[PDB]
């Protein structure tokens, strides 16, 4: 479908694994907000100022209808499970790297299905929790997902970074490498 | 690998020329298989998959559901576009463009929206031979970045130039490399 | 406020 702007006013997700779910609004491929279903809390991702408001109850009851329909469809398919795809990982910086100028490392994991994955960063082969953040599962036209993880790092000549993703389609924790070419 | 049964629902709105041509497609998906679809240009539910046949046949029988979905293109799509017209569609951030070799690369980073055309110049004449360009990289934080490389034969060359144009730029950006 | 699309329940 061709259009000037495409929005997903309700990417609703519910899976039996956790069990877990996800509710986000997307406009032109980017995430406007998500709803923390466990905390019953709307978390906005707009890069602007806005007085907008969205009641998190809509997500909770919408996902409830998804759970209702999922159980009945797991039954009507003689239990057909989701087949695990192989994620495609790519690491790159947000800005050109300058020594000593704080930057952001981006780890794009694409073609995710089912929507379940651990994404962690390693620095010099050791784990790092400070300065890491990620997006929700963003939707794709083939109904898979992609996730993007961010690592705020200070470029130096001694720090080495890897992106470690783990998915059932992998059968081996993938590590994508990146070095600061100044 | 433990078994997982997913379910997806996507109320996708398509806008062309402001709100002239607006189209809603609500997709109900079992795993990665869209089973039922409400196409606003069709007017009613249409099963895409055997699984969706009993779901579509039922929803189509309920008059109240049909009236809600036929009006969702206005109640949801066109309504949200009005507040989209005041927020994200106003977002214009200028790209930061630098030049460095590895082959000459022009790094255009952190710009919104996505529509961007960049050109390479050699000495004033647009070098178009061997200008491999990269896809549009979505950073996921409401910014984009794009890299453009050029097969440069630099011997006795003088001043390469990267020239980018963007909806946030009143006058286009020009950065050179002597 | 942003409105959102609603998924319909199927017959059990």
């Amino acid at each position, epitope marked *: 479908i061709v259009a000037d702007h495409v929005a997903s006013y309700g990417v609703n997700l519910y899976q039996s694994y956790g069990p877990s779910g996800q509710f986000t609004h997307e406009f032109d491929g980017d995430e406007e907000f998500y709803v923390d279903l466990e905390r019953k809390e709307t978390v906005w991702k707009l890069p602007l100022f806005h007085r907008l408001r969205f009641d998190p109850q*809509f997500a909770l009851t919408n996902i409830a209808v998804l759970k209702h329909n999922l159980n009945i469809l797991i039954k009507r398919s003689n239990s057909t499970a989701a087949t695990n795809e192989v994620p495609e990982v790519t690491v790159f910086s947000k800005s050109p790297v300058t020594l000593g100028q704080p930057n952001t490392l981006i780890c794009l994991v694409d073609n995710i299905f089912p929507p379940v994955v651990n994404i962690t960063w390693l620095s010099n082969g050791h784990s790092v929790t400070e300065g890491v953040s990620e997006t929700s599962f963003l939707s794709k036209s083939d109904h898979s997902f992609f996730k993007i993880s961010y690592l705020t790092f200070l470029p130096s000549a001694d720090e080495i970074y890897d992106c470690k993703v783990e998915h059932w389609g992998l059968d081996e924790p993938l590590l994508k490498h990146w070095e600061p070419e100044i | 690998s433990p078994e997982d049964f997913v379910y997806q629902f996507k109320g996708m709105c398509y806008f062309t020329n402001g709100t002239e041509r607006v189209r809603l497609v609500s997709r109900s998906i079992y795993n990665r298989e869209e089973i039922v679809r409400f196409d606003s240009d069709v007017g009613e539910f249409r099963a895409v998959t055997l699984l969706g046949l009993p779901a579509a046949e039922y929803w189509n029988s*309920q008059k109240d559901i049909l009236e809600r979905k036929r009006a969702a293109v206005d109640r949801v799509c*066109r309504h949200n576009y*009005q507040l989209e017209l005041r927020t994200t569609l106003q977002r214009r951030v200028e790209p930061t463009v630098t030049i460095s070799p590895s082959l000459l690369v022009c790094s255009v980073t952190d710009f919104y929206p996505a529509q961007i055309k960049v050109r390479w110049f050699r000495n004033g004449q647009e070098e178009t031979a061997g200008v491999v360009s990269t896809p549009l990289i979505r950073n996921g934080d409401w910014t984009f970045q794009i890299l453009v490389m050029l097969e440069m034969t630099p011997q006795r060359g003088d001043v390469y130039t990267c020239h980018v144009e963007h909806p946030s730029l009143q006058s286009p950006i020009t950065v050179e490399w002597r | 406020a942003p409105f959102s699309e609603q998924e319909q*329940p199927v017959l059990g």
Partner: antibody
Amino acid sequence: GVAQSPRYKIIEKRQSVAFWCNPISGHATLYWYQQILGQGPKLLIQFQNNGVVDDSQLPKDRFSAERLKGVDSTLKIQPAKLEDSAVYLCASSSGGWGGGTEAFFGQ
Amino acid sequence: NSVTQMEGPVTLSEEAFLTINCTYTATGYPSLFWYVQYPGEGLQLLLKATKADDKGSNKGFEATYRKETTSFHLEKGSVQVSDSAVYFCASPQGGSEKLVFGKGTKLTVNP
């Protein structure tokens, strides 16, 4: 349709009452209204499933409601004010999940 | 609130033409309702229009959702004595679509 209980209730001036309501099976939204004598229904509270969505017009000094499991609801008033003499309506609606937003009222 | 009704009681003869004005204000694309409350009964839904130019009709009552005038006037060609009731104009408002009712219009049809 929606079931309400009781149909009539007499209570003393400084006393407590509890109104029970069972919505149409599967309806998300549930309202409690107040209709005083010859007037229109004044909205008190609206439930989504089990979560309160609107309670701007609910006098928390004595009025309180709950819909724990997201099906039946109970509205309580304590203490009572002689101004509370009215008909307390309960209504339910699919809220867009399974049907329209129209509300179906009880007795 | 956001729905203004024909304030005041109405009295008509056994075959007169009934017209109850109702206008809305809210931005966006709301649904419009008409609820009837017969004397000694609960509130029934009379008719409703979900979107633009849709006309709800029931029991000989008609109401056209008119965007050009932000109106939804209730009409009936030949009223009847059994039509004596209170008629409420309603439109759901807010992000959650809460059904809020107007003041209502009392109608007594004399024979």
